[PDB]
Amino acid sequence: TDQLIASVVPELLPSAELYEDPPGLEPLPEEEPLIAKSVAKRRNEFITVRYCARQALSVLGIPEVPILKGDKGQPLWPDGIVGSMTHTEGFRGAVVGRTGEVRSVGIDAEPHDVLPNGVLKSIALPVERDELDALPAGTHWDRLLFCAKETTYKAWFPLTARWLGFEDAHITIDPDGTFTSRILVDGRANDGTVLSAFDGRWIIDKGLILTAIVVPKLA
């Protein structure tokens, strides 16, 4: 009803989220090596986010399956599926969709708080600093910019297999719940197209920021 991800992605991309770790969850056997020596926060975020991912996959008709990690950390979905996952204090969530419907999806959740000391200087272009200062009072625009940049990478990486730095995209945030990401580097993609700009959506609720980008199919 009031799920954050569902508010920022199309209905044809099922999503699921939780705000706490249900007690007693375990990963699938194939997933255990990915968190073998991990601390409690990492184990629990990994397990619960995959619980949410499998719930969303079931809506698309896909029964229980491991969700392993690819070359540079990207989640590895079944044939015909794209998706994205995110976890932070107070949130685990996942979204999935069919490749016949969209090219890529990225999401990212952050607490709705001022960025840690020094992070804004590291991630924002000078022009972005000025733009954030101009936006209306009452939202942590610095944290929203950071969130949006991470969503940009998540949407970009499965389509390019290349790094994208914080300095390599200019994100413009609108108060209306949308943002744009303008790519400043070579945007050639692995399907033969060029990625120059992404359209994003954002919501703040439950003390969290959630950003999302869907990269549509082309004609």
Ligand X SMILES: CC(C)(COP(=O)(O)OP(=O)(O)OC[C@H]1O[C@@H](n2cnc3c(N)ncnc32)[C@H](O)[C@@H]1OP(=O)(O)O)[C@@H](O)C(=O)NCCC(=O)NCCS
CA angle 166, 167, 168 (to 5 degrees): 90
Tell the smallest beta-carbon distance from residue 169 to Mn ion (Å).
15
Near ligand X by CB under 6 A: residue from 14, 75, 93, 200: 75
Near ligand X by CB under 6 A: residue from 15, 44, 48, 86: 86
Q: Is 51 in the site for ligand X (CB under 6 A)?
A: no
Helix, strand, coil tally for the chain in percent (to 5): 30, 30, 40
- Interaction mask 88-127, Mn ion, x per CB under 5 A: --------------------x-x-----------------
85 binds, among ligand X, Mn ion, Na ion, none (CB under 5 to 8 A by kind): ligand X
Near ligand X by CB under 6 A: residue from 54, 103, 154, 201: 154
Q: What is the DSSP string of 4-34?
A: TGGGTS-TTS-EEEESS--TT----GGGGGG
Query: CA–CA separation, 73 vs 59, rounded Å?
Result: 25
Footprint on residues 159-188 left by ligand X (CB under 6 A): 164-166, 168-169
Alpha-carbon distance values, 93 to 33, 45, 82, 209 (Å):
21, 10, 15, 12
Name the binding residues for Mg(2+).
Answer: 87, 108-110, 150
Alpha-carbon distance values, 204 to 106, 177, 201 (Å):
17, 9, 11
Q: Contact residues for Na ion (CB under 5 A)?
A: 161
Q: Contact residues for ligand X (CB under 6 A)?
A: 46, 49, 69, 72-75, 85-88, 108, 149-150, 152-154, 157, 164-166, 168-169
